[PDB]
Design a protein around this ligand. Structure first.
Ligand code: FAD
Ligand code: FAD
Ligand code: STL
Ligand code: STL
Ligand code: ZN
Ligand code: ZN
Lengths: 228, 229
C-alpha cells in the first residue's frame, strides 16, 4: 500500500499542469494507491508567514520571531489548522509530488508559502534531524515542473543555464534538508510552444513514468549532482 | 540625485532584517538619496498570482493563462493597482535593494509573490527584450540576505554548498532576466549565532558599504560567476 500527496499550483483546471496533475491522479488511483491533492489556488492557500499561523496567544508577542513561534506552536499543538491539515497529509504520504509551472526559476509564491509554512521546525526537521536525517526521512519527493523556456536554453551554456542549477534550492535546500529522498525531477519543457502532438507525448511520458515510480531509486542530492 | 527602493520582507521591526533595512534608510537618507520602502508584511502584500490581478475583459476567459492575461493587462493599464504601485516605485528607482531572511534557499513567499506579480512581461521584459535587453536595463539590484546557516555551511565543501549557488534563480533567472545589472550580494550570515558585537559589526558593515554604493560596478551575472569553471 502506498500513499501519495500531490501539491498542485496552477490556477486553471485545463492547463498543461492540470493535465499532468490529472494523469498522476488517474494512474496512481488505477494502481491502487491512496491519493490526496492539495490544490493550492482552489484552496486560497495562504502564502504569508505571519503570526496568525500560531493560535492562542503568542509565546513572545513583544518581538515576533516566526521560526521560534512556529517551532513552539508545533510542539504545543497550536498551529493554524490550514498548516496542520497539510502536515497530516505529508505525514501520511509515502511520496509527495509537486506539480507546478516554473516561476522565476523557482516555485509560484503560493507553493513557496506552502513550503515556508508547512515545513516547520519540529515537523520537517530539527537539530539534529536534517538533510539525510531530516524528520521526513523515508518519504520520497518529486518535482514535476513545466517551463516557458526550451531544453536548449536550459543547458550549461544556454541562456538559462543547466535545469539542475535551479533545482538546487528546491531539491537540496528544501526537500533534502527535510529528509526526503529526491526522485529525479520531471521536467516538461515549453508546452505553450510544443505542438498538440508534442504536448500529448509529454503527458504520455509522465503517465508511463508513474507506472514504475515505486521501482525508482532516488538521485544523489549533491552539489556534484546539480553542478559537477 | 539617486532614487532607491527597498523591497523589505520581515514580520518584525526589531529584527536583524529590520535593523538592516533601517540602517539602509538612515544612510541613504543621509546621503541625500530619495528613498522608498515597500514593507511587504505591513502592506499585507498579496503573493498569489490570480485572475484578480486583471480588472477588465480577459483575452481568453475560458482558459486562464496568467502570463498572457497580465501582459495584456499591463499594455491596457488594467492591472490590479497594488501591482501598478510597485511598478512605479521600481520604474523610478536607480537601485532596488531586496532585504530578506533566506527561506528555503530563496525569498520568503511574500517577496516571491512581489517578484511573480510585479515583474510582468511588458514591464520588466518583452520577448524579445530580456536578459541584457530586459526592459529594466540601466537599473541596479542588490540582494541583502540574512541566513540561519553559517558562512562555512555555505561553502562549496560544506553541507549547504556555496552561497552563490542559491543566488542563481534570484540574480540570473529573475533580476538579470529583467535587464538589471546586479550588485554584489550582501549576505549577513547567521546573526542568531553571532554575538551582540558581531551583529553590530554586520549592521555597521552594511552601512559602511552603502556609503560608497554608487561607486560599485555590477557582477558578471553568468553561470561561471555562480558555479565556477
Ligand atoms: C510569473 C511567471 C514567471 C515565469 N518564470 C519563468 C521562468 O523562470 N522560466 C521559464 O522557463 N518560464 C517561466 N514562466 C513560464 C511558465 O513556466 C510557463 O508558462 C508554464 O510552465 C506553462 O505551463 P502551463 O501549464 O501554464 O501551460 P499551458 O499554457 O496551460 O499549456 C500549453 C498548451 O497545452 C494545452 N494542453 C493542456 N493539457 C494538454 C493535454 N493533455 N494535451 C495536449 N495539450 C494540452 C493547453 O490547453 C495549452 O494550449 C513564468 C511564468 C509566469 C506567469
Ligand atoms: C520558513 C523558514 C525557512 C528558512 N530557511 C532557511 C534556509 O533555507 N537557509 C538558512 O540558512 N536559514 C533559513 N532560515 C533561517 C532564517 O534565514 C534566519 O532565521 C533569518 O535569516 C534570521 O534573520 P532575522 O532578522 O529573523 O534575525 P533575528 O532573529 O531578528 O536577529 C537575530 C538577533 O539579532 C538581534 N538584533 C537585531 N537588531 C540588532 C542590531 N542592530 N544589533 C545587534 N543585534 C541585533 C535580534 O535581537 C536577535 O536577537 C529559515 C527560516 C524560516 C522561518
Ligand atoms: O520555520 C523554519 C523553517 C525552516 C528553517 C530552515 C532552515 C535551513 C537552514 C539551513 O542552514 C539550510 C537549509 O537548507 C534550511 C528554519 C525555521
Ligand atoms: O508574468 C510573467 C510571464 C512570464 C515570465 C517568464 C520568465 C522567464 C524567465 C527566465 O529566467 C527564463 C525564461 O525562459 C522565462 C515572467 C513573468
Ligand atoms: Zn541534496
Ligand atoms: Zn545572469
Amino acid at each position: 500500500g502506498k500513499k501519495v500527496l500531490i501539491v498542485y499550483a496552477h490556477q486553471e483546471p485545463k492547463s498543461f499542469n492540470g493535465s499532468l496533475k490529472n494523469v498522476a491522479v488517474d494512474e496512481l488511483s488505477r494502481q491502487g494507491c491512496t491519493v490526496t491533492v492539495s490544490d493550492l489556488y482552489a484552496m486560497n492557500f495562504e502564502p504569508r508567514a505571519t503570526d496568525k499561523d500560531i493560535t492562542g496567544t503568542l509565546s513572545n508577542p513583544e518581538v515576533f520571531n516566526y521560526g521560534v513561534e512556529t517551532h513552539e506552536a508545533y510542539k504545543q499543538r497550536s498551529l493554524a489548522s490550514d498548516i496542520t491539515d497539510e502536515q497530516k497529509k505529508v505525514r501520511e504520504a509515502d511520496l509527495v509530488i509537486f506539480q507546478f509551472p516554473l516561476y522565476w526559476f523557482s516555485v509560484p509564491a503560493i507553493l513557496k508559502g506552502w513550503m515556508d509554512r508547512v515545513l516547520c521546525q519540529g515537523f520537517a526537521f530539527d537539530i539534529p534531524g536534517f538533510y539525510d536525517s531530516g524528520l521526513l526521512q523515508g518519504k520520497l519527493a518529486l518535482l514535476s515542473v513545466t517551463t516557458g523556456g526550451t531544453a536548449e536554453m536550459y543547458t550549461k551554456t544556454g541562456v538559462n543555464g543547466d535545469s539542475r542549477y535551479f533545482l538546487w534550492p528546491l531539491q537540496h535546500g528544501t526537500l533534502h534538508f527535510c529528509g526526503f529522498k529526491v526522485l529525479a525531477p520531471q521536467i516538461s519543457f515549453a508546452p505553450e510552444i510544443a505542438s498538440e502532438e508534442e504536448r500529448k507525448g509529454m503527458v504520455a511520458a509522465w503517465s508511463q513514468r508513474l507506472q514504475t515510480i515505486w521501482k525508482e531509486e532516488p538521485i544523489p542530492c549533491t552539489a556534484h549532482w546539480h553542478f559537477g
